[PDB]
Structures are given as C-alpha cells and as structure tokens.
Ligand binder design. Structure first.
Ligand SMILES: Nc1ncnc2c1ncn2[C@@H]1O[C@H](COP(=O)(O)OP(=O)(O)O)[C@@H](O)[C@H]1O
Ligand SMILES: Nc1ncnc2c1ncn2[C@@H]1O[C@H](COP(=O)(O)OP(=O)(O)O)[C@@H](O)[C@H]1O
Ligand SMILES: Nc1ncnc2c1ncn2[C@@H]1O[C@H](COP(=O)(O)OP(=O)(O)O)[C@@H](O)[C@H]1O
Ligand SMILES: [Mg+2]
Ligand SMILES: [Mg+2]
Ligand SMILES: [Mg+2]
Lengths: 528, 528, 528
C-alpha cells in the first residue's frame, strides 16, 4: 500500500528508539542479578523468562519505523541463539552499545560506511584476541562451572549436566524433558534403544517387570511386513535348533506369523519377541542398517538379494541381552565388529556436515549416540509448569553453553573477556585507514565495555567505577556481580564459552554496523 | 470508479512531486559515500539495500497523482536493472534531472513534444560518443576493478568475481548463494554435473567420502524407466566382460534391475552405479542428449529406433572418470568428439537468442556451461541474514557489471563518462531543428552532470565546484569521491561499464521525455 | 499556564525550524535580483516590501517552539535596523548561516559555550579587518552610488539623495514624504522655518502668492500671551519711528493687540505680522531661545527679568528678510553673530548624546538643522499608494545607508567585504584556545560567505562557483549580480557602508551564538 518515507535524523531517531526499546527490555535479564521478564501468551499462562532471545522475539511496536529498528536487533538475538544458544542478551546489549556510540559519530558528520568498515576491522582484531585468551575446557569441574553460570548460578543444574556429559561422552546426546518430581533427575540410556514395544503381551518372560528379556538372542532385521508363517518358518527352525531367543525387527508381524510366535512362547517350545521396525520412511531403513551393523548381522531384504526363506544364522544379528518393554526395547550392546561400527559412525558424521534441516542432524546425532555413545535425559523438577518452563530454558541454556565450551574453549566471564581482548587488540596496533574508520574502531572499543556495565548496573553498583577497576587489573581479574567483589574470574567460577562471546560480538557488529549506515527508511503508512 | 482529472500545472506539480520523492530516496544510495535504505517487510526482518531499483520498487504514495510520477520513474530503474543489472540509481538520478530541467522549459511555454524530440537527439549523440570513449575490458585486473567499484569499494568481492570469470571463462555461469562461513568462498564445478545422486548406498566404492567413483566407465543413456532385468541383461553382459564400470542414467531403476545392480556390487562381479535422469519434461531429454554428445554415445530410446536389448558398447557413452555422490554426479571428461560438442554448443546458443522466458536462457546457459565451460558458485559469507542479503545484492550487482564490462567495454566512472561524452557530442555539432528542440538538447546537457553532482553531494563536497573542475580536465580525469582527490579515473580504479552508463541514460531519457509532454492526468478519485 | 518542555535535539530542531522559516522568507529579498514579499494587513492594502526587517517583524508561527526561534532571528533584523537602518536581510542571512553551521558542531558533541566564545573571537577579528578595508566616503559620486545600491539599483533615488546631502550639508536633516506627482522631487528649506502661519489675512502685503514678506524686520520674542494693547504699545512705538517691520512671535496675539496690528496694517501706519510661538511645552522655549540667538535678540519674559513694557530695540531680534505664509514662516537669515550661533549648535549637539527618546534626538537634530544647516524634503512620486510605500521604504534605506557611509566609510558590496575581511583575519593568525573554540571560528568563516551565496542564488547562478572565483581574487574584485560579471566592485559602483556590514555581522553573531548554546526550551503548552 502507501509508503511513508523518513530521511536523515528523523529516520535514525525512529530507528534508534526501536533499538533502545527492545534492548532495554532485554537489558533487565542480563547478569546474575538480572531479573525475569513476563510475556503474555494468547492461550493464557504467561511465560517467565530470563533469556534475551525469548524477550526479543516477542517485541513488536505500533510505530512501524520504530518496529524496523526492533526487528533488526531481534536478528542479533536470533542469530546468536541459532549459532551458540547463549549470549543473546549480551549480543543485544552489544548491538545497542554500537548503535548508541555510532550514532554520535554519524551525527558528527563522519561517513557511516567507513564507520562500518572500522567496526568490522576492530571486531576482527578483538575476535582474534579472544582466541588467544581462550583456554580449553578439559576438566569436568569447568563443565559444571560453565553450566552453573549459564543456568543463573544454579549449581544443581551445572552438576547434573557435567554428570550427563561424563556418562555419554562427547558423542552422546543430552535432552531436556519435564519431570514428575520436584527434583532434577538424570536418566542415561546406554547402548541402542529405538523406543518400540512388543506386539503381544505374551512375549513377556518375567511378570515383575512386564519386560521381555532375551539372553544371547538372535536379531532378525526385515524391511518388509511379515504376515504369513511359511516364509518365517525356515529361520525359526534354525534358531529353534540353536535354542537362543530370536528378536524379530520388522515393519509388522501379524496374522499367522504373530500367532505362531505366541504359541511357541506359551508352550515354551521357543522363546522369542517381535518389535516394529523403528522410524518411518528412509530413516527406518537407515536405523535398520545401523542395528544390523551393530549386531553383526545383515538386514534381510529382496532389494539387496537376500530372502527370508533363504536367511541363515550368519545373516542374523547377535547380542548378549535385549529387553523389550511396553513401548521401548534396548539392545544392551551389539555383537558387531567395532571397526565396522566406527566406520559407520564416521560415515554419519561425515554426512552430518551436509545436513540442512534442523531436525536432520539432530536425528543423525541420536543415531551416532545409539551406535557409539549414549542418550541422556535430564528431567527438570518443578512444582508448577511455569517454573518448569523457566527451569527448562535455564537447563537448555546451560546445555548449549557447555557444548560451546568443549568446542572452542572458555574465557573469563562477566564481560572481562571482551575487555581483555580489547586491550590486547589495541596493544597489537589496531588502526584504521582513515579517521572515519578510526572512529569506527573507537565505537567497538567503547561498546565491548557494555556487557560488564549492564551486569554491574543490574547488580546496583556504579558501572564506570567497576569497569575502570577491571581495566586496571590483568588476566582473569574481574568483578563478581553475585558477591560484589573483585578476584580471579576463573577461580570464582565465572566462566564463559569463548564461542558464545565471539558469536555475540560478531552478530551484534554485523547488524549494528548496518544500522549506522541508514539515511532513508521506508515503511507502510498508517491507515489514517 | 469515479476519476479525478488534473490539468496543466496542477497536474505537473503532482507528477513532479512523485518523481522527486522517489528519486530523493534513491539519491541517498548513490556513489561510494552513499548510504543504505531500510525497507520494512511484512514478514519482519527489514531489508537494508543500497540498490536503486530495490528502493524504487517499494515506493508507493497515498496521493494517486503523485503516485503516477513515482510509478513512472520507478520503472526507469526496473528497465535499467533488466538490461544491465546496475546503474539503476544513476538512471533514476538522470530521470529526475531531465524532469527538473525540462519542467523549467515547459513552464516557459516551450512545446514539450519538441523538447522530447530534442532530448532524443541529444541522447543519441551522447550515446554515440560513449561508444567512442569506451575501451574493451581485456585484463582480469580491470574486471576486478569493475567488480570492486560495483560492490561499493569491496576488493574481496571484486577479486573473487575476477577469479570466477578466469576459471569458468566467458562461456561459464556464475551464481551467488548464501555461505556458512563468515568469508566469501568460490566453488568451481568443472565438466558436467547434473545434481542427481545414486539410487542405493551400496553403489559406494570408497567409504571415506561416501562417494561412488568409476574409472573409465560406460554411460548408458535411457529416456524410459527401467524396472525389469531381462532388458538390462544384454547390455550388462556387454559391460561385464569389458571390465569397465557402467553408469546408468535413466528415469528410474527399481525392482529387479536395481536389485541386480546392487547384488553384483557387493559380490564384486560387476561394479556399476545408477542415477536418475536429470531434469523434468523436455528439458530432461535436452540434457540427456547433451550428455550423450559429450560422452560420445547415443541415448537409447524406442522413439529413435534404438532398443535396450539391442544396445551395444558403441552406443554407450564413455568418460575418463565419473564420481557419484549422495546428491550429485560429475562427469570429469566426456569422450565425445570436440567438433560435435562445439556444434552442439552452437545450436544451444542459437536457441539462447530465441529464448522467451527468464528461466529459459538461464537453463540454456547452464547447459552451455556444462558442455563447454564451467559453473562457478560464490558463497557469500556474513554473520547475520540481514548482512547476508545486503552483501548478496552487492555481489550480484558486481557480477552484472563485470558481465556488462566484457560485453561492451569500460568507461571512466564517477559520472565522468557522461561529461566526456557530452563535450564530444557538443564539439561534433549537436543541434536541433527549432529553438524548442535546442532547449531539449540543453536539458540533456545539464542532466548528464547530475550523476556526478549527486555522487559529490553524498560525499559532502560542493557539486558545482567539483563538476567545473572535472569539465576543465580532459580524458579520464575525474574526481574520486572515496578519497576526495582528482586524478585519472582509470588509473585510480574507478571504472564503469559503458553498457550500464548507456542503458541508464537511454532509459531515463525515454521516460522523463514523456513526462515533460503531460498536460492532463487521470486517477481514481479518493473515497471522500 | 501549563508549560511544555523540550530537551536536546528535539528542542534544537524546533528552534532551527523557526530560524529557517523566518530567514527563508527574508532570503527572497536579498540582492539586486531579490524579489518582493507581500504581507497581509488587517485594514486591507497589503504592503509590498523588499526589507528584511519588515518581513521578519510580521512572521509569527503557530508552533510555539518554532516561534521562539523565529522571534530570536526577528531580533537580529530589528537591532540591525535600529543601529544602521540597512543590512537587515544580510544580518538575517548571516544569523541563519551561523546557526546552520554551528548546529553541525553542536551535533558533533562540541561544547556550544566554547563555540560561542570562538564565534565572538572570529567576529572581533573580522570587524577589525573591516575597519582597515573601509575607505572614507568623501565624494558626492560615492554618495550617489551608495544610495543607488541601497535603493535597489535606482539611480534617480541615489542622485536625489546625493543632491539633498550636498544642499543641507552633513549637519542638515533629510526627510521622506509622499509626493503628488509621479516623479521624485527635492525641496530644500534654508534658514529657520517653524511651520507657523500668520494670525490674520490682513497681514499679507502681496496678494499674488498670499504671503506676508517683511524686509529687514524686527523680531519680538515673547513667552507669554499678548492680548492687551497697553503692554505692546511701548515696543510698537519704538519700531514705528524706525520704519522697519515687526514680527511678533508669541503664543497668541488676540483681542486688542491683534486688532491694533490689523488696523495699522490696513492704513499703512506700521507694517507687521504676528505668528504663534512654535512648539509645545519646553520645546517651545528652546526653539524660541534659538530664534533669539539666531536673530541676535532676547526673549522678552518676566521669568528672566525682561518686561514687554520695558522692551527696547536692542532686545529685539533682527533679520534681513522674513516671509509668513498661511501655515508657515521662514526667517531667511538671522542677524546674530556666528560665534554665538555655533556655541548654541555645540550645546544642542552635546545634548543630542544625552537624548533618550527617538523623537528626542530627531527634534534636536531638527533644531540644529534650523540653526546651522538646512532641511530637505524628498517627496516620493508614485502612481498608487502600494507603490508609494514600497518606494518610500527604498528611499529611507538609501538615506540610512548614505548616512552610514559618511559616518564609518564604504566597503566593496556584494558580500565581498566580509570575504576580504575573513581572508585578512585568517592571514593575521586568528585562532582559539581549544578545538571547540577553533570550530566556533570556522563557523564564522563559513557564515560570512552566505551573503554572497544568497545574492548569487537569487540571481540564479551557482553560489559555490562564484564564491570560489571571488575568493581567488584580491582587493575590490567581486561579482556584480545585476550584470552577472566579475570586476572591481568600487568601479562598478557596488558599494556598501562598512557600518552596515559591521552591524549586520555583530548582531547576527550575538544572537546566533546564543542559539547554539540552547539545551532546553520552555513554552506554553497548546490549549487543546
Ligand atoms: N557471578 C557473576 N559475576 C559476574 N558476572 C557474571 C556472573 N555470573 C554470570 N555473569 C555474566 O553474565 C552473563 C550471563 O548473563 P545472561 O543473562 O545469561 O546473558 P546471555 O543470556 O546473553 O549470556 C555472562 O556473560 C557472565 O559472564
Ligand atoms: N571511488 C569513487 N569515486 C568516484 N565515483 C565513484 C567511486 N565509486 C563509484 N563511483 C561512481 O558511483 C556510481 C555507482 O553508483 P551506485 O551507488 O553503485 O548506484 P548504481 O549502481 O545504480 O549507479 C558509478 O557510476 C561510479 O562511477
Ligand atoms: N549589482 C550588485 N551586484 C552585486 N551585489 C549587489 C549589487 N547590488 C547590491 N548588492 C549587494 O546586495 C546587498 C543588498 O541587499 P538588500 O536586500 O538591500 O540587503 P539589506 O537590505 O539587508 O542590506 C548589499 O550588501 C550589496 O552588497
Ligand atoms: Mg546466559
Ligand atoms: Mg552500482
Ligand atoms: Mg539594503
């Protein structure tokens, strides 16, 4: 429809007002002494959150020109959440600091394109200094400290995450679900479990658990439905001769085939259990192949030339124990050759880099976890689901930060890392080509102080005095906003993932630099 | 509905007001010191653009009479983007200058139709002088300079585009897509790649990369589905005793045929791979014939008289090497006669001259690139999506300008080319048939100074002083707005494609000349 | 009532908007090619003026915050008109230039109080250089040129004013009144005339022109009413045997005294005339004393000790000729000694410095003109009243400028004087204490170019090109906007009073400097 066009300061003033409104709301949640933000939901039960990205995504302004500024800052938080899962409040605070400091130079008449080029030059220098300052996260104590800090000083969340990563290793998958009790509990699933139950209660061999337990069983992988007994009889006779139990993993076992199994179970002639093949579509085939590789067998399929009638014991997978519950079954550990298992894991991890869908690599990682790792479930305990949603966001934030810690390392928290990186970059000789680029560098140098300033401001102290004292110190020296005292940030456990710090600065600079270079602003005009 | 009618000056002022509003918004982005324009999107994430056509297309005015002026100037940039892909801001600036200068003569009682005839006469003379001033773009250094200027003084974009054109040649195709890293990367695909993967993972011969490499294989081109085995056996036997691998390019290979190929792969009897035929509809037939010509084979089809059962080794295509990945295969080098390949390329380029849809020659050029060239992919690296879109537009603009540079040549940039062409045209005796036509010539003579004036105005200097100094100079002498220094434009790297300059002037003159001849305007009346 | 308070840039943008609105209206009248402004009057007959002060005084804005800015610029023009009577448009233009240039430095974060201090420092230096450039106005040709320029290139007005100043000298008084003809006419009144007619038509001695001429008469000065014949008889008898006529200057001659004079005139016994004493209150006494000093007589008053009954011939004033018309009488030349006349003139000129009212010094100058000079009346000729008012304002401007020219000298016009003074001041080492004061100096250096820029802009040429050419010249070299050519401005007759140029700059700097220091604006809130 009709468009309203704003120029020069009338457009920048509207843009900055939208930037400030969104960032001020996100500001309140920053730091250990940051406070919660309540966001109304259409379906009732307002959410309480301390996450910057959650607050940013819910902000829309009636003024369309102000809304444009808010939408661009919302991009900073959204990108930081996507790439790091943490630091969205820090990224939003940094973006507002760059805009606030950059608009002073834009009003001073300097070329904003050179300011943006100077901003990029300074951010590149500071990010390189962050890499040098960063230290690897090797000890599980550091993992707990990183998780504790990112969970808003919750030691229980940090400890349970450190235990989860210890149990499932680096290749494991950790998820967060609602708990039933009031306390956090960690459930670790070892081996391969594909969450499929038996097709008949008569497969159960012990009533105290209602779980079909098979000791040293054969595993039959089939990619087609099984209904008649004629084709399944030849393999049944072989496993009957051996005496070992048989686990039939196929799309479905019904009619004569299912009936025959339950008869042999009741009379004790042959113990067996049947489960549905996990997953739908091609994912069902992929996990079926993984089970065959893990169990040392081959999936029987006419697409590969194998037939159920001609299937032999060598084509069947093996294990020492599998237990089938009402809705899940776990192969404790397959009998396949570990070299082939490692090769299969290598193939998936190579293909992981090519994954595009967000659910794609998530489902590919659980396959790797099922193969050569474990799956940990952290069940969050809370009295009410409004507290459960708040705690789950904190647990998920701590999981993202701890994952980023093992990837790129850790740096001192409380905004100290940006200050230390800034001083190193300046000492190295950071400079611009023209005075406008030098001003752009000075924008970033002042802006990196903002995360510490807003942390201190939320704590109720004077940001300028604290920042000056921190700059006087060297190394990991910093300010603990939780206790209001200075000290070695690493010793007091205030740790930040360097990936989160680097991502927050890079995302903030890219968007805030563009917002400095705006002269005209076009939005749809109001409906009178 | 009801129409409101405006006459004489009352109509012209409304028309000019719409011209000025659109052109002023586009003005802000002109030159190296031009600034960005933010346009709000309905779905959030406002776009930040420096392109004139992008800004112009989003401008609509509440006043319907002012909207006509905006709509008519808007399509000056639309036509310039269509034919050159660059210079849309220059075209919009030129169109406003002609309207502004022409309205003075219309208000002076001069015949606007003779003004339009004089404008056309002057533009024809200036365009001819642009051809004489233009110099061919031979060196790759000039290509980098042209790309750097069009990417808003970004040497990385200019250098990567120059490398891309060097690798793929004049007949190659270069595309721009999003990157995953923060840096621009160039991926060059040589030979023929048709972005289709294998039909079965068992075709993989090396698990390190999950790829299927066939060395000196036969290629079977089939335009019909393959499902049974009795037809594929005669050609499979012929492939078998030769020892070379076989690549089957058909619509689909399922059932018995797929199983037989998979079975022989595991047993090692005969190594082969099967891929789906690329393309849909008649386009699938076209590239299948191209593959047959490239590989020195014939597509087996009952529509031509060939049969799969009667297919022989001579009918099969050959290549030195082909690799089949999960989603694409690349024929490294076909065995076809280069004379036939050149003839095939000649036929397609003839069809290119006749293509009527935008995707028609685009796919036709892709076929030519697959045959006798290469496909280069520039992955733009940016931290956020908003910066990614802005960078991609700059890379696309630089690609269009470099293509225009090799097509028609280069001229000194910064509005110098129009000034030099104007002086040459005046010195050649440019005159009209009557004083009204002479005024139309004087409109264009003043208008061509506007691109330099607006570049200098955005740079903050005095346009009239700079223009006078530039006119005092000769040849490539000009003003560098980036550095604020006078000098040789070609030596300083400020290069412009002569096609972009010619297209901008011709499109601006055609529309702005018509706008001078308007005496009555008719629009739908407002709803009270 | 309730007050609305604005801060920072919101307050400044409203202040500047009011400044620009008033100055843009005044801009249109600047220079030889400036155009008229029509102002609505409540009682009909709109005034057409080219005066900056007249246009500025009529401008009031609905926005109270914008009105505050307009009221301060209106103050610049009012002060310039008060002290110089010309240069009000130049002062308004200079004030806007300082505000426009100074707002850029205020927006750059510089201290505006130091900007004001730098502005004052630069203006002091430039005014000093204006004194050196200024040359005295000693020739009547220069007076005509100064009057011609200030009358908007009207040679007739300049010539008639030059003639008027020649006739009445430097001590004379020139006034402007409406004329009955279509051409300007100059009426010079020599000697003492106090615009008082005879008391009876029988005093007329020649009916051709209805005037009463007395040759070598005695003058009787009386400060009290004369009604009875008894007191007037002793003096009347004394002048009877002398044979000379008698002029009686008293407040009133009525009753027996008036009748006796009429009877003696009719019978020819004693020729006489009687007039009212000019002026009211103490001004009547002062002018009566001046007449006595001029005529060499004494004022017969009981307040000094003299009595009408004891009045003698030596106490009576004398003159060689006096003529009494219906409403005025002129003493051709008094018989008093020049030494006492000059002493009386010196006393009044000393009192002139002490005058506290505008009419106070105006009437004092009239007394001095009556004593030792002349009174010239310029009757402006015009066809209509609207043209008469426009012409009268131009004549008053030329009168004010010519008076300023003889006081302080003349400088090259067209804004050249400010440019030459700026170059001399910079070459002399004009500098500030701190960089903020240096910026304040740079404000004035750019601002003094504005009068030439707006003169050229009204002429339709390019201001920046002309200014550069003028600056590259030296001395009186400048641009003639009337003829559009460069040359010696003194030779071409474009002259300006250095008092007008100095007053315009000083008044503009004082107000515009304060406007830069604005942070908060308090105005009455709208009444809703
Ligand atoms: N006890 C503490 N003392 C000082 N700083 C702390 C402390 N705990 C956390 N921080 C800092 O606060 C930041 C976490 O605030 P948070 O609201 O999580 O921001 P974000 O979600 O953007 O990471 C971290 O950068 C960390 O350095
Ligand atoms: N450093 C420079 N100095 C002077 N002129 C330049 C410089 N860089 C680019 N230009 C000029 O600016 C113009 C580029 O305008 P641009 O903002 O890209 O819009 P468009 O591409 O629509 O013309 C070109 O004509 C070029 O000649
Ligand atoms: N022929 C001319 N060429 C150039 N400048 C001129 C000419 N005539 C007048 N001027 C300049 O124009 C100014 C007069 O403009 P005017 O509207 O009278 O302004 P103001 O009333 O404020 O003095 C003078 O300063 C004079 O120097
Ligand atoms: Mg956090
Ligand atoms: Mg361009
Ligand atoms: Mg004047």
């Amino acid at each position: 429809a009709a468009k309203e066009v704003k120029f020069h300061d009338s457009a920048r003033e509207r843009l900055v007002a939208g930037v400030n409104l969104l960032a001020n709301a996100v500001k309140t949640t920053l730091g250990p002494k940051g406070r919660n933000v309540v966001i109304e939901r259409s379906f009732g039960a307002p959410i309480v959150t301390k996450d910057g990205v959650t607050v940013a995504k819910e902000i829309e302004l009636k003024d369309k020109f102000e809304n444009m500024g808010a939408q661009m800052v919302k991009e900073v938080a959204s990108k930081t959440a996507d790439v790091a899962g943490d630091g969205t409040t820090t990224a939003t605070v940094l973006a507002q600091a760059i805009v606030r400091e950059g608009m002073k130079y834009v009003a001073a008449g300097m070329n904003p394109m050179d300011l943006k080029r100077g901003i990029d030059k300074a951010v590149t220098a500071i990010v390189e200094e962050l890499k040098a300052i960063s230290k690897p996260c090797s000890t599980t104590k550091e993992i707990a400290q990183v998780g504790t800090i990112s969970a808003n000083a919750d030691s229980s969340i940090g400890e349970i995450i450190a235990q989860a990563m210890d149990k499932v290793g680096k290749e494991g998958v950790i998820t967060v679900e609602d708990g039933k009790s009031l306390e956090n509990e960690l459930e670790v699933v070892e081996g391969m479990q594909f969450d499929r139950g038996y097709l008949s209660p008569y497969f159960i061999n012990n009533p105290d658990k209602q779980v079909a337990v098979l000791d040293n069983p054969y595993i039959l992988l089939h990619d087609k439905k099984i209904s008649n007994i004629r084709d399944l009889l030849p393999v049944l006779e072989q496993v009957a001769k051996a005496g070992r139990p048989l686990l039939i993993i196929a799309e479905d076992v019904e009619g004569e085939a299912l009936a025959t199994l339950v008869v042999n179970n009741l009379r004790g002639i042959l113990k067996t259990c049947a489960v549905k093949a996990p997953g739908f579509g091609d994912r069902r085939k992929a996990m079926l192949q993984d089970i065959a590789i893990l169990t040392g067998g081959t999936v029987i399929s006419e697409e590969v030339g194998l037939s159920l009638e001609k299937a032999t014991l060598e084509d069947l997978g093996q294990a020492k124990r599998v237990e089938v519950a009402k809705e899940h079954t776990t192969i404790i550990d397959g009998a396949g050759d570990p070299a082939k298992i490692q090769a299969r894991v290598k193939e998936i991890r190579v293909q992981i880099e090519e994954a595009t869908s967000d659910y794609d690599r998530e489902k590919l990682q659980e396959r790797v976890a099922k193969l050569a790792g474990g799956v940990a479930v952290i069940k969050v305990g809370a009295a009410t689901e409004v507290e459960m949603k708040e705690k789950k966001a904190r647990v998920e934030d701590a999981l993202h930060a701890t994952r980023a810690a093992v990837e790129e390392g850790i740096v001192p928290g409380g905004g100290v890392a940006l200050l230390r990186a800034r001083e190193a970059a300046v000492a190295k000789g950071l400079k611009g080509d023209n005075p406008d680029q030098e001003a752009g560098i000075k924008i970033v140098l002042r802006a990196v102080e903002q995360p510490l300033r807003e942390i201190v401001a939320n704590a109720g102290e004077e940001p300028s005095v604290i920042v000056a004292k921190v700059l006087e110190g060297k190394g990991n020296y910093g300010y603990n906003a939780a206790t209001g005292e200075f000290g070695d940030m690493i010793e007091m456990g205030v740790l930040d993932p360097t990936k989160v710090t680097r991502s927050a600065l890079q995302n903030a600079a890219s968007v805030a630099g563009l917002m400095l270079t705006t002269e005209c602003m076009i939005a749809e005009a109001p409906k009178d």
